[PDB]
């Protein structure tokens, strides 16, 4: 059983100091056993083992004993990996002094050497007086999971761990605000660690592992449209590889491709379907990102009107030979309300190709009443290549296939245009990022690196509804968010020309919320029952005014954004201006804030972010502010998140509080309320918000899920104004107690 | 005598679970038993190639990964590999002359399409991580630990089907055949059915849930995270195999078709008694045959023979036996996380998510009720 | 005799495609056939249920429908109906104890899976349309003349089975049981597969297809759509198991595995040339009696009378026999461009 | 038609520009019915960290699949399809994996 340390020198057996560290980690808990920790760990004790397998399985042997009637396991599982940590890192448990171990850092090269430019000594000891270390405790253990495998600096082909969670939020908020007037800067900074270390504010991963280091490519989620061209498509191929290998995941418009048969050249060659540049994208976005701080992700979009969409809409499918199938890229399908009522009155609707109908195709997205005047013009011509699919048939494949893989997306665009703080005509809305998540406009290029082309570049936070207590505190993070954001904004380093303009141009941004389900549940609310409208009116009306309210500020103190003569923020109208009327019928809360002041504000001045929310997915960020994923509810009082970096136990927070008030995933009769309380939300909220469904067979007859319900649930999300439609999550009772 | 379709019409809901009348046409509207059209049913909601996990990471970990437990991974797939044909060749051959009602015929052929499919799922998660598979499939059928489970499994069905052959050529009764006398008797016809049948829920009961624990105690840490994630879709699958077979053989104990069989049912359950604890012996050698090298994380020799004793305590419990170890609790309580499909909130864009259901929707518009829907 | 297991190690790759030691293992990188490697693939990715298609309509058009129309259709649906029990049942016990090759053995286990899935896909088609799927079906077991052709087609599966039965029992020779005589012989089970083999080839290949070409002549008119997809899908599961067939006999005959199967072959042409003509005639009589009421909604006897020749002819000519009957143009063109596309 | 194309020599640096590069060449010469021959043995190989341990590296296997699934895109309506040769050296250190990259016994991944 003897002892080994790091580096082959062994040693006499020695558990009492190893039973010492679990009293240490389990001191001020309740319900747990060291007892039978020590039962569950002393048997896969070998001789001559190491410590470095020793506090791996007594961690493990810690943490699987997470479940829904001792959840203070959690606590202690992540206290000891904390240690662990620790001594991975510094040898000891005291943390190194703070200026010691940046420039130790900026010498291996880890770090940024601008902080050690523009900080002197004094400052960083000033700065250590601010860092909390016994901060740490409070994570939880799917936290510390994700903290240690993905995010602190360390090393991948060796596996070496360097600093800690207080460094790295201190640091985070030292790189942020270094770019200010020292008088206040330093106040800046502590306030923004205290407001990120105490889970008041939810940062993403590429930022939360980007800002301290030589690599600089902050922007979370990138889009990319792409020409009926060769050269468009090696420039989309050429920004997929650069971008996917920063940590970006990616939205590629590529409906507006030809369609098989189309000719090419004037008429000598002819065109062979859009599978191969599917397949080159997908072989471009899976190839060169694998062995980085996370895997390739890029969404597809396509209008249904396609004149391949009978063969595009399956890709994602699981039955059929590689040579027709492109099954590791989300899928997104673009639908309207002429589609919409092609539908209702059962009639035929018409497939052309996007490439040999003049205006039709930008017609789709800019004015809906242009698009129902081309659209019937060239069904009536006839001298076009054009195909007839029934709309019944249509509608019902697609939903087919939603359910059957999960993962082919719907977006609503004629919301995403009539409803947003862009104008329809100048810079309409074409596409949305990977999660369905965000809107923002674009332009196809002709090069890698030109300046006609526009790559929308955005970044993301969130709040945390979990640790406020009223909505003051919400407009203080929203002033100290937004300076933050713009701080990255301008710091960043574009790899692409035509994403540094997009970027710079247009200063766009995204902030949402997660931790939503522990706020509404502790306000003795739930999901189903349609008890949360008012609630949710409230909420989302304080944060998009707040939101508003700090971006004026900012734009009032450092000048407006370059391209606001393109917004619809400058013509003075308002989400409460232009948010869908079939929205009164659901919700009865009035407005609070002043909202026809801080218009004419807007008005007089301008906003310095031309796009403030946005509400996202946020499933690894949420983690470490033990937090639930957004605006979905959890899964179980014990909630298994499965990810490359092990699969973790999370208790829903204040479980011992709540284990009677939550409304589960699979205890909601439908999802009718979850799409009333997102639609409101997509009313308050400037561009799209990711919105997944739910379908439990076991709460239908004969176990089938009736395609009426699926039918009626995609007009239902329509009809109240919900821009897009993310997931399918579709139970299966694969029972197995043991 | 056997015939692929007899003519004489006969009411198939009173003909018995084995043994009747050779099936006529079959169909799925009145239905006998319900518990195995709602498997066929589950089944072919259920379907999955074994192409839409990329464990293009997981050959680079397998091949980081030290030499013991690469080895402990592909004996693992090599001893699944090799029971899997096994089981889905048998159960056609030897359960399908012996069957009365359709829906129990088209279970059975389904059962055996879905061994296919996770054959060729292990061949292919063989293919991918190294590059010998020639070696590794030709050690298969060469080596001993593999060869005499293999043999312990198949004895039962060889002498089934050899009695099923003699039943239906011959007769019932006492018989001269080459100069030798033979008794082919309907009761011990029987009794040696309930004997495969037992060995066989054994087999998908202890023995792979042993495997997928070893296999899955890999994945727990950071490793072969794909490979894990096909092994838990065919987990899933072997988890509604092992019900299937467990309702059918307590169906025919229970005393619904014959008090003879329930008879047979008490002097093949000491039988199969002394079976389990020979198929349980069996796993504990191949666990201290595998973990001889040296122990990986939270999995060894103490660890696997705890689960050995454990699911065999819960198997016979659930397939109404007696009980040959102590009640103990479960030495590796996060297979339930592997196992348990229900509260684990998977994170996509990294991982894919076995949660489908394969074209289980009605796909009946009500076109005019839609109508009523102003947008 | 036969075992589940066998306990030697044999070059998979050497050992004949029947009549060899029986499989162990169960291996897909070094395929001896090709053929049968693709043909799972690609049966793989045909999968299918019922549950997708829409049948409402359907339901409505058979109300509307003619008595007589209501007839043929129910009648024809009958007998495919027989013609999917007796495919998915039969294959298996009748040849898995006879194959020596994993990927063959597969193929036939995949094979009989999609057989499966026709049978689950006729009776869902039938209790959608009508309210007495009992009376429907005691019908199809009580009605002589599909009775008649079950007789033909379930005589050769049995007799298959009872001679293989027989020689992995007692051996080879001439032998005594029970006072009788019986002489088992390779030969005459080689024989015997060869016919049954035979059979399931002109099985899938033209009663299936008269059955498509009455269900889409009947869809033709607009009606019955749902019906129309679904044997849409199984006449392309159809046309991949007659594919799969064909070069299992061609395999067979061409004395490439075995040069006693080819002089096996080579003298048994004659039953499997009458074999294949009784069909057809069995086909074009069924189809005399279907027309009792007069003609369908737009078609008469000669139609489908010379699509079955053009059919047998054609199969017949590819898997390797003389032509029966003076070929002439395509009858019913718009058929072959209904089933696979 | 002043376009008389046949083979094509490129090579392929060790960088993204130049994978970049590269296969937007291999596009744009197979759209013109070419044949291309690549020296794509300079890509280093897997393990070696990416910025000084900052990433880890995956190999050559993914961007040998770009190049292909480039190559193979558009020459159906043309005289050949798209066909290429890569090059590289046998010290290379996952040759041994390299060198079996055509043989069905394995899978496409
Ligand atoms: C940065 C990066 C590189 N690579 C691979 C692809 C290229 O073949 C190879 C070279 O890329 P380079 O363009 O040379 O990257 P680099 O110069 O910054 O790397 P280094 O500091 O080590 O010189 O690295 C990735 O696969 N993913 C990535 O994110
Ligand atoms: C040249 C060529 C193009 N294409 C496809 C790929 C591109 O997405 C699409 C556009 O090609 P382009 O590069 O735009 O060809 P072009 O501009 O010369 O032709 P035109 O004037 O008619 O627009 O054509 C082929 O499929 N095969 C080919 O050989
Ligand atoms: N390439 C890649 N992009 C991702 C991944 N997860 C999220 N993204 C992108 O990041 C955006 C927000 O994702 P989010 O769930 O908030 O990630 P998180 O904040 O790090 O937890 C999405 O729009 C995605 O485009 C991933 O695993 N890979
Ligand atoms: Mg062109
Ligand atoms: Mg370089």
């Known amino acids: 059983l003897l002892v080994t340390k790091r580096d082959g020198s062994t040693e006499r057996i020695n558990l009492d100091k190893i039973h010492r560290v679990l009293d240490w980690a389990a001191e001020g808990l309740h319900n747990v056993s060291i007892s039978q920790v020590e039962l569950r760990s002393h048997i896969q004790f070998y001789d001559g083992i190491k410590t470095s397998d020793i506090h791996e399985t007594i961690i493990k042997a810690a943490a699987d004993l997470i479940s829904r009637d001792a959840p203070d396991y959690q606590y202690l599982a992540a206290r000891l990996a904390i240690f662990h940590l620790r001594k991975k890192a510094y040898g000891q448990f005291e943390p190194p002094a703070l200026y010691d171990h940046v420039v130790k850092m900026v010498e291996m090269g880890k770090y940024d050497n601008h902080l050690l430019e523009d900080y002197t000594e004094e400052e960083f000891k000033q700065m250590d007086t601010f860092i909390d270390h016994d901060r740490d405790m409070t994570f939880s253990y799917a936290a510390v999971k994700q903290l240690e495998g993905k995010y602190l600096v360390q090393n991948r082909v060796t596996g070496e761990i360097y600093e800690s969670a207080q460094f790295l939020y201190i640091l985070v908020a030292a790189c942020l605000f270094s770019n200010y007037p020292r008088e206040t800067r330093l106040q800046y900074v502590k306030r923004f660690y205290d407001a990120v270390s105490t889970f008041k504010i939810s940062l993403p991963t590429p930022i939360m592992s980007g800002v301290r280091t030589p690599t600089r490519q902050f922007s979370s989620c990138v889009l990319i449209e792409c020409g009926d061209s060769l050269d468009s498509i090696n420039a989309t191929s050429s920004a997929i590889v650069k971008y996917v290998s920063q940590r970006a995941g990616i939205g590629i418009n590529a409906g507006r491709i030809r369609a098989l048969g189309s000719p090419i050249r004037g008429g000598e060659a002819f065109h062979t379907g859009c599978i191969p540049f599917y397949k080159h994208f997908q072989t471009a976005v899976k190839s060169c990102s694998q062995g980085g701080v996370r895997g390739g992700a890029a969404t597809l979009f396509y209008p249904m009107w396609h004149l391949e969409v009978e063969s595009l809409l399956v890709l994602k499918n699981n039955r059929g030979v590689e040579g027709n199938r492109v099954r590791h890229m989300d899928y997104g399908v673009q639908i309207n309300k002429l589609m919409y009522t092609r539908l209702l009155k059962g009639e035929d609707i018409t497939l052309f190709s996007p490439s040999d109908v003049p205006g039709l195709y930008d017609a789709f997205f800019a004015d809906q009443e242009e698009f129902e005047r081309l659209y019937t013009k060239y069904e009536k011509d006839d001298s076009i290549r054009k195909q007839r699919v029934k709309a019944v048939e249509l509608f019902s494949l697609m939903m087919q296939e939603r359910a059957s893989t999960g993962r082919i997306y719907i977006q609503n665009v004629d919301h995403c245009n009539t409803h947003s703080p862009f104008d329809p005509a100048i810079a309409p809305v074409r596409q949305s990022n990977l999660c369905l998540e965000i809107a923002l406009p674009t332009k196809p290029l002709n090069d890698v690196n030109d300046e006609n082309g526009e790559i929308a570049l955005c970044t993301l936070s969130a709040f945390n509804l979990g640790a406020i207590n009223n909505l003051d505190e919400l407009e203080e993070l929203a002033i100290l968010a937004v300076r933050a954001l713009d701080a990255l904004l301008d710091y960043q380093d574009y790899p692409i020309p035509a994403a540094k303009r997009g970027a710079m141009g247009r200063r766009t941004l995204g902030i949402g919320v997660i931790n939503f389900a522990y706020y509404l549940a502790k306000h003795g609310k739930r999901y189903s029952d349609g008890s949360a409208n008012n609630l949710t009116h409230k909420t989302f009306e304080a944060i998009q005014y707040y939101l508003l309210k700090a971006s004026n500020e900012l734009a009032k103190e450092q000048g407006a954004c370059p391209w606001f003569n393109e917004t619809t923020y400058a013509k003075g109208i308002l989400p409460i201006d232009t948010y869908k009327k079939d929205l009164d019928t659901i919700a009865n809360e009035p407005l609070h804030y002043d909202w026809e002041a801080l218009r004419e504000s807007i008005k007089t001045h301008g906003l310095r972010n031309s796009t403030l929310s946005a509400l996202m997915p946020s499933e690894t960020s949420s983690q470490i502010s033990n937090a639930t994923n957004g605006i979905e509810p959890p899964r179980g009082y014990v909630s298994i998140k499965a990810s490359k970096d092990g699969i973790l136990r999370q208790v829903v927070p204040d479980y011992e509080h709540l284990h009677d008030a939550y409304e589960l995933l699979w205890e909601m009769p439908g999802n009718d309320g979850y799409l009333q309380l997102v639609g409101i939300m997509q009313k308050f909220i400037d561009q799209s918000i990711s919105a997944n469904t739910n379908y439990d067979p076991s709460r239908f007859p004969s176990g089938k899920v009736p395609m009426q319900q699926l039918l009626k649930d995609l007009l239902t999300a329509y009809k109240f104004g919900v821009k897009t439609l993310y997931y399918q999550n579709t139970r299966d009772g694969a029972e197995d107690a043991q | ?375």
């Not at chain 2, 009173?14 to 059209?37: H, L, S, T, W």
């Not at chain 2, 048998?90 to 296919?116: D, G, K, Q, R, Y």
């Not at chain 2, 039962?156 to 050899?162: A, K, P, R, V």
Request: proline letters at 3%; glycine letters at 4%; a negative charge.
């Open chain 2, 1 to 375: 005598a056997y015939t692929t379709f007899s003519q004489t019409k006969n009411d198939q809901l009173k003909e018995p679970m084995f043994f009747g009348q050779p099936v006529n046409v079959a169909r799925y509207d009145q239905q006998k038993y319900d518990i195995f059209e709602k498997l066929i049913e589950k089944q072919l909601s259920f379907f999955w190639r074994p192409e839409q996990v990329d464990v293009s990471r997981d050959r680079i970990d397998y091949q980081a990964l030290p030499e013991h437990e690469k080895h402990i991974f592909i004996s693992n797939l090599k001893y699944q590999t090799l029971l899997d044909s096994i089981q889905g060749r048998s159960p056609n051959v030897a359960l399908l002359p012996l069957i009365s009602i359709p829906e129990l015929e088209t279970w059975v052929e389904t059962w055996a399409f879905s061994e296919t499919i996770h054959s060729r799922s292990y061949t292919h998660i063989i293919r991918n991580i190294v590059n010998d598979p020639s070696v590794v499939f030709d050690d298969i059928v060469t080596n001993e630990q593999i060869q005499k489970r293999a043999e312990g499994i198949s004895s039962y069905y060889d002498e089934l089907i050899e009695m099923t052959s003699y039943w239906h050529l011959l007769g019932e009764g006492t018989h001269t055949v080459n100069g030798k006398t033979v008794t082919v008797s309907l009761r011990e016809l029987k009794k040696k059915l309930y004997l495969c049948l037992m060995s066989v829920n054994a087999l998908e009961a202890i023995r792979f849930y042993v495997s997928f624990a070893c296999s899955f105690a890999f994945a727990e840490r950071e490793l072969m995270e794909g490979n894990a994630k096909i092994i838990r879709l065919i987990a899933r699958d072997e988890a509604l195999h092992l019900t299937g077979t467990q309702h059918m053989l307590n169906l025919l104990r229970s005393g619904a078709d014959d008090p003879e069989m329930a008879e047979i049912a008490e002097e093949c359950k000491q039988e199969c008694y002394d079976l389990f604890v020979q198929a349980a012996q069996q796993e504990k050698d191949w666990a201290d045959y595998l973990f001889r090298d040296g122990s990986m994380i939270g999995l060894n020799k103490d660890i696997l023979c705890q689960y050995v004793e454990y699911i065999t305590n819960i198997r016979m419990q659930a397939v109404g036996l007696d009980l040959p170890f102590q009640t103990r609790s479960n030495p590796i309580p996060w297979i339930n996380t592997w196992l348990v499909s229900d509260n684990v909130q998977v994170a996509p864009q990294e991982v894919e998510v076995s949660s489908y259901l394969v074209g289980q929707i009605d796909s009946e518009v009500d076109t005019d009720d839609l109508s009523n829907f102003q947008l």
